[PDB]
Design an enzyme around this catalytic site. Structure first.
Site, PDB file in Angstrom:
ATOM      1  N   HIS A  42       0.858  -1.055  -0.076  1.00 24.70           N
ATOM      2  CA  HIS A  42       0.010   0.086   0.006  1.00 24.70           C
ATOM      3  C   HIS A  42       0.873   1.368   0.009  1.00 24.70           C
ATOM      4  O   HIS A  42       1.997   1.307   0.428  1.00 24.70           O
ATOM      5  CB  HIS A  42      -0.858  -0.060   1.103  1.00 24.70           C
ATOM      6  CG  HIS A  42      -0.056   0.277   2.600  1.00 24.70           C
ATOM      7  ND1 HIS A  42       0.495  -0.825   3.153  1.00 24.70           N
ATOM      8  CD2 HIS A  42       0.152   1.198   3.368  1.00 24.70           C
ATOM      9  CE1 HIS A  42       1.127  -0.620   4.361  1.00 24.70           C
ATOM     10  NE2 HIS A  42       0.876   0.894   4.368  1.00 24.70           N
ATOM     11  N   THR A  44       0.125   5.375   1.367  1.00 25.39           N
ATOM     12  CA  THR A  44      -0.528   6.235   2.022  1.00 25.39           C
ATOM     13  C   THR A  44      -0.433   7.671   1.788  1.00 25.39           C
ATOM     14  O   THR A  44       0.415   8.051   1.857  1.00 25.39           O
ATOM     15  CB  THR A  44      -0.091   5.883   3.665  1.00 25.39           C
ATOM     16  OG1 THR A  44       0.330   4.489   3.873  1.00 25.39           O
ATOM     17  CG2 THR A  44      -1.167   6.462   4.370  1.00 25.39           C
ATOM     18  N   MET A 117       5.770  12.068   1.545  1.00 23.75           N
ATOM     19  CA  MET A 117       6.810  11.251   0.802  1.00 23.75           C
ATOM     20  C   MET A 117       6.045   9.842   0.126  1.00 23.75           C
ATOM     21  O   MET A 117       6.143   9.028   0.873  1.00 23.75           O
ATOM     22  CB  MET A 117       7.974  10.876   1.555  1.00 23.75           C
ATOM     23  CG  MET A 117       8.959  10.118   1.225  1.00 23.75           C
ATOM     24  SD  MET A 117      10.025   9.106   2.262  1.00 23.75           S
ATOM     25  CE  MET A 117      11.460  10.450   2.923  1.00 23.75           C
ATOM     26  N   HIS A 119       5.705   6.482  -1.167  1.00 22.97           N
ATOM     27  CA  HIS A 119       6.419   5.112  -1.109  1.00 22.97           C
ATOM     28  C   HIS A 119       5.563   3.961  -0.777  1.00 22.97           C
ATOM     29  O   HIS A 119       4.599   4.096  -0.120  1.00 22.97           O
ATOM     30  CB  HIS A 119       7.517   5.073  -0.171  1.00 22.97           C
ATOM     31  CG  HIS A 119       7.026   5.327   1.317  1.00 22.97           C
ATOM     32  ND1 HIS A 119       6.642   6.535   1.968  1.00 22.97           N
ATOM     33  CD2 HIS A 119       7.070   4.253   2.112  1.00 22.97           C
ATOM     34  CE1 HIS A 119       6.483   6.559   3.154  1.00 22.97           C
ATOM     35  NE2 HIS A 119       6.562   5.154   3.467  1.00 22.97           N
ATOM     36  N   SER A 121       6.126   0.732   1.154  1.00 25.47           N
ATOM     37  CA  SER A 121       7.003   0.273   2.138  1.00 25.47           C
ATOM     38  C   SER A 121       7.269  -1.230   1.827  1.00 25.47           C
ATOM     39  O   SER A 121       6.178  -1.968   1.625  1.00 25.47           O
ATOM     40  CB  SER A 121       6.457   0.527   3.447  1.00 25.47           C
ATOM     41  OG  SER A 121       6.791   2.068   3.882  1.00 25.47           O
ATOM     42  N   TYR A 124       9.335  -3.448   7.881  1.00 26.06           N
ATOM     43  CA  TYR A 124       9.400  -2.690   9.052  1.00 26.06           C
ATOM     44  C   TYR A 124      10.327  -3.739   9.760  1.00 26.06           C
ATOM     45  O   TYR A 124       9.801  -4.872  10.118  1.00 26.06           O
ATOM     46  CB  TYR A 124       7.892  -2.660   9.866  1.00 26.06           C
ATOM     47  CG  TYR A 124       6.867  -1.857   9.013  1.00 26.06           C
ATOM     48  CD1 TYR A 124       5.556  -1.861   9.327  1.00 26.06           C
ATOM     49  CD2 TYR A 124       7.276  -1.095   8.063  1.00 26.06           C
ATOM     50  CE1 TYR A 124       4.583  -1.340   8.726  1.00 26.06           C
ATOM     51  CE2 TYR A 124       5.981  -0.655   7.056  1.00 26.06           C
ATOM     52  CZ  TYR A 124       4.645  -0.437   7.696  1.00 26.06           C
ATOM     53  OH  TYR A 124       3.779   0.009   6.792  1.00 26.06           O
TER      54      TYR A 124
END
Length: 185
Positions: A42, A44, A117, A119, A121, A124
């Site tokens: 995803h 955001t 920004m 992106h 991801s 994590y």
């Protein structure tokens, strides 16, 4: 005074039923060598404030009634400096996308000031710079087309999200809507 529960929601711009697994493989993969909580591919565009039950839907209700579908180009693979900006597909500020950010400001609730920004991801995981280099280093042994990569944002998802919950257990999907604009025929 009628609706008394307020929560922080984040709006998620979803990928394609042709992109996601190309991703999911890279995600479920990077997450074995190095590790962490494997989530959904995803991008955001917004993070809300304390919105009651209705006030949230009506709001996603409005958003979905918009944010025409668009595309992203993976400018590069990059690393951030904290559990959430570990490895991510750093995106290019092409028009249509940086404007999916005008969504966090889209109408009334923001979270007023951060330099959006874009992106997707990948992982994590509070890593050590050296393993970070590798996560990235290693990421490019699963995808070589990864760079220059372009993709479509077929839809959205409204999610109850607790931005510091590294366990991501409080993150839950409340709703999604599909957005395939084309307009005039």
């Amino acid at each position: 005074m009628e609706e008394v529960k307020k929560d922080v929601y984040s709006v998620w711009a979803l990928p394609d039923e042709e992109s996601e697994p190309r991703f999911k493989k890279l995600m479920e993969a990077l997450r074995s060598e190095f590790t962490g909580p494997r989530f959904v591919p995803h991008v955001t565009v917004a993070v809300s404030a304390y919105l009651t039950a209705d006030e949230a839907k009506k709001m996603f209700e409005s958003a979905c009634d918009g944010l025409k579908a668009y595309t992203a180009t993976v400018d590069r693979v990059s690393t951030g400096t904290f559990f959430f900006q570990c490895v991510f597909l750093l995106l290019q500020t092409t028009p249509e996308v940086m404007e999916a950010g005008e969504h966090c400001k889209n109408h009334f609730n923001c979270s007023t000031t951060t330099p959006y920004m874009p992106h997707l991801s990948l992982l994590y995981a509070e890593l050590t710079e050296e393993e970070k280099k590798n996560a990235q280093e290693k990421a490019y042994t699963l995808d070589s087309s990864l760079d220059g990569l372009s993709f479509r944002l077929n839809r959205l998802a409204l999610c109850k999200t607790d931005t510091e919950d590294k366990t991501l257990e409080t993150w839950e999907t409340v709703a999604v809507c599909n957005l395939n604009p084309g307009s005039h025929h």
